[PDB]
Design a binder for this molecule. Structure first.
Ligand SMILES: OC[C@H]1O[C@@H](O[C@H]2[C@H](O)[C@@H](O)[C@H](S[C@H]3[C@H](O)[C@@H](O)[C@H](Sc4ccc(I)cc4)O[C@@H]3CO)O[C@@H]2CO)[C@H](O)[C@@H](O)[C@@H]1O
Ligand SMILES: OC[C@H]1O[C@@H](O[C@H]2[C@H](O)[C@@H](O)[C@H](S[C@H]3[C@H](O)[C@@H](O)[C@H](Sc4ccc(I)cc4)O[C@@H]3CO)O[C@@H]2CO)[C@H](O)[C@@H](O)[C@@H]1O
Ligand SMILES: [Ca+2]
Length: 629
């Protein structure tokens, strides 16, 4: 039977759980899918409050697993996995096996360059540029008897707000859509949302396809899905604890474990270079695993034809430390219950485990924070690495991977999300590499937390960097990176990050005994419970400093291109963010938002992000479990 838990904090989790699941609060859609946030006027990662992410589903699984632990009821965790497989993992209709089975592992895809500015798109396909071999496809088709991929597509238009519908019908919900397509300078604000299933029924004469990649002839009807590695890994991580807690109570989630294991098997596609080029020697085409960096890259994606059979799959050359999950790798490589069926699944994940922890240590700054990451494709075109640039296995160090507007590693969040996984690993295995990373990182963040007399508090929000880490020498190890520094630009009261911080410090303290980490984690949880609770969970007023882009941000549309969004909005050069999303004017918060801009004030909101709420609950659960008194 499960060990006794701290009743005070267990109660707080149960409370939050009721608030999150309460139909009156509106965190879920009528199909049981969680929204990114209750409020619809939302722009940061997705550009609409009621479009969800894989990241959300994974937090949904974590919440339900924690609920099983305290109620003995795991049916909600099982339903959490049913909704995922039904709505976020493309079905047989969404990814036609007729097309996926025509896939060729020797020529996985056609090379196309990446540009530092949205106006350089569409990018031209070049069949003369080399592409390496895919070593894991035959492992996967053979173990599962299908050519379709089993991973989650990252973003979903839950209530068909954009109008694309399901597979071009325009009326079904949920709707598979995608946003980001045009480089490091394309923010949430500069995209042109498009359907995953493109039959040319919406947009331009060829749907939205020729906005992004330019081919030699007429674009074909096609589908494409993009995975968010960090969410799939988090799904595995959460499924593991659900398995642990269920067994402790004579119950089983055997079936959910099978799904999670298959997902981790396919998740290995993120270990490869975008066009399978050798790691450390980008101009040469890969021969197999020599194109594997073994890290959880920014994505892996696949697509195929709709009215003709063919398909493609790509990895990602860009690697951010915030996506890594050392715990999920430990699980899939050492736990018999999660041993992947594919021949190399488990051992590949063992290699990822060692490589991931080297990456973290390679990026640890003088102060303790973790730097961005590295890439095997400089400027996204496999260009020459400037002399002087530090490297990790041939890959060049990049301060802000994949995005520059704003930099992907300027948000404190990446710090806690990634390191929380390193804390779970250290707690369960006492691994030495994890201890070293945590002792220094934990000391940094503990001196950066501020508690005010009135009970409120602050933690880092926006951070900045200087220098670069020393070139990684595996035999030498961590030099200390004296020339790599982190600067805290400004503080804030991000309840999600505060919660994720509490979580990280709790696991670490529970293993190391660091009293400071323990009292801070608890002060944070207490602070949020006492001063930020509300009817729907927790919240605070925050400024939305980028909302002026709602009205002043120009969206690039190529010369001569004209199209329509399902609702009729015309797409042409000159349009602004709001012009191709005119429905945003019916939002309850619209007039309030615009009035503030007109009067020259930064708008403000009291937001309820689904993941932040779950993060707060889970955090309370972790504490109740590790510190029973
Ligand atoms: O059209 C006929 C040829 O198709 C080839 O396959 C290509 C597809 O046609 C094409 O649409 C896609 S475009 C693809 C981008 O290359 C990739 O960067 C991204 S995922 C992503 C994530 C973040 C950001 I910022 C930007 C992108 O996904 C895009 C699709 O959504 O590319 C494939 C191959 O590169 C066939 O290979 C060929 O046989 C056909 O002739
Ligand atoms: O992609 C990563 C995840 O992002 C999550 O969303 C986070 C944003 O990415 C992050 O930028 C913001 S931090 C943001 C504050 O919320 C805002 O109040 C301030 S406004 C300000 C104030 C003073 C001054 I001087 C200048 C500006 O601006 C900050 C950014 O600069 O936090 C959100 C939520 O944590 C997504 O929720 C998640 O899905 C993504 O994975
Ligand atoms: Ca930009």
């Amino acid at each position: 039977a499960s060990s006794p838990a701290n009743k005070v904090y267990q109660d707080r989790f149960e409370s939050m759980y009721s608030k999150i699941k309460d139909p009156a609060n509106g965190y879920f859609s009528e199909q049981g899918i969680p929204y990114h946030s209750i409020e619809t006027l939302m722009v940061e990662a997705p550009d609409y409050g009621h479009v969800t992410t894989s990241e959300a589903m994974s937090y949904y699984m974590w919440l339900e697993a924690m609920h099983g632990r305290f109620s003995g009821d795991f049916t909600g965790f099982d339903k959490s996995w049913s909704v995922t497989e039904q709505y976020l993992i493309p079905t047989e209709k969404d990814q036609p096996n007729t097309s996926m089975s025509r896939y060729d592992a020797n020529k996985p895809a056609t090379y196309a360059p990446e540009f530092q500015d949205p106006s350089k798109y569409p990018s031209p396909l070049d069949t003369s540029q080399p592409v390496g071999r895919d070593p894991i496809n035959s492992q996967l088709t053979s173990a599962y008897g299908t050519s379709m991929l089993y991973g989650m597509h990252w973003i979903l238009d839950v209530d068909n707000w954009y109008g694309f519908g399901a597979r071009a019908d325009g009326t079904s919900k949920p709707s598979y859509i995608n946003t980001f397509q045009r480089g490091e300078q394309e923010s949430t604000w500069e995209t042109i949302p498009q359907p995953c299933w493109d039959e040319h029924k919406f947009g331009g004469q060829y749907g939205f396809l020729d906005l992004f990649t330019k081919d030699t002839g007429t674009p074909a009807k096609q589908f494409k899905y993009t995975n968010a590695p960090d969410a799939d890994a988090r799904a595995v991580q959460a499924t593991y604890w659900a398995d642990q807690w269920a067994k402790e109570q004579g119950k089983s989630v055997s079936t959910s474990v099978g799904k999670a294991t298959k997902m981790g098997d396919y998740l290995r596609y993120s270990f490869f270079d975008k066009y399978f080029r050798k790691i450390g020697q980008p101009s040469q085409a890969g021969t197999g695993y020599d194109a594997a960096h073994y890290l959880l890259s920014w994505y892996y994606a696949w697509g195929g034809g709709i009215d003709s059979t063919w398909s493609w799959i790509i990895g990602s050359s860009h690697n951010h430390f915030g996506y890594q999950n050392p715990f999920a790798a430990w699980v899939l490589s050492t736990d018999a219950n999660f041993k992947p069926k594919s021949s190399n699944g488990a051992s590949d994940w063992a290699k990822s485990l060692d490589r991931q922890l080297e990456f973290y240590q390679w990026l640890q700054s003088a102060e303790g924070a973790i730097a961005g990451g590295a890439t095997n494709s400089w400027n996204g075109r496999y260009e020459a690495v400037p002399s002087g640039t530090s490297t990790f296995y041939g890959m060049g160090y990049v301060e802000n991977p994949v995005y520059a507007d704003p930099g992907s590693n300027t948000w404190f969040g990446m710090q806690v999300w990634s390191m929380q996984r390193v804390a779970e690993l250290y707690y369960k295995t006492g691994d030495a590499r994890a201890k070293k990373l945590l002792d220094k990182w934990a000391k940094w963040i503990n001196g950066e937390i501020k508690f005010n007399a009135d009970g409120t508090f602050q933690i880092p929000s926006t951070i900045d960097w200087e220098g670069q880490p020393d070139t990684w020498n595996p035999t030498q190890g961590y030099t200390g990176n004296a020339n790599l520094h982190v600067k805290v630009v400004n503080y804030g009261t991000d309840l999600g990050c505060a919660s994720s911080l509490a979580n990280t410090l709790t696991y670490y303290a529970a293993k190391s005994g660091d009293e400071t980490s323990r009292q801070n984690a608890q002060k944070l949880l207490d602070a949020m419970w006492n001063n930020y609770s509300d009817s729907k969970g927790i919240s605070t007023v925050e400024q939305r400093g980028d909302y002026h882009r709602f009205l002043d941000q120009e969206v690039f549309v190529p010369a001569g291109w004209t199209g329509k969004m399902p609702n009729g909005d015309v797409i042409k050069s000159g349009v602004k963010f709001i012009d191709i999303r005119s429905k945003y004017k019916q939002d309850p918060e619209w007039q309030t938002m615009v009035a503030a801009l007109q009067a020259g004030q930064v708008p403000t909101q009291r937001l309820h992000r689904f993941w932040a709420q779950s993060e707060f609950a889970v955090a309370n659960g972790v504490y109740a479990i590790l510190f029973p008194d």
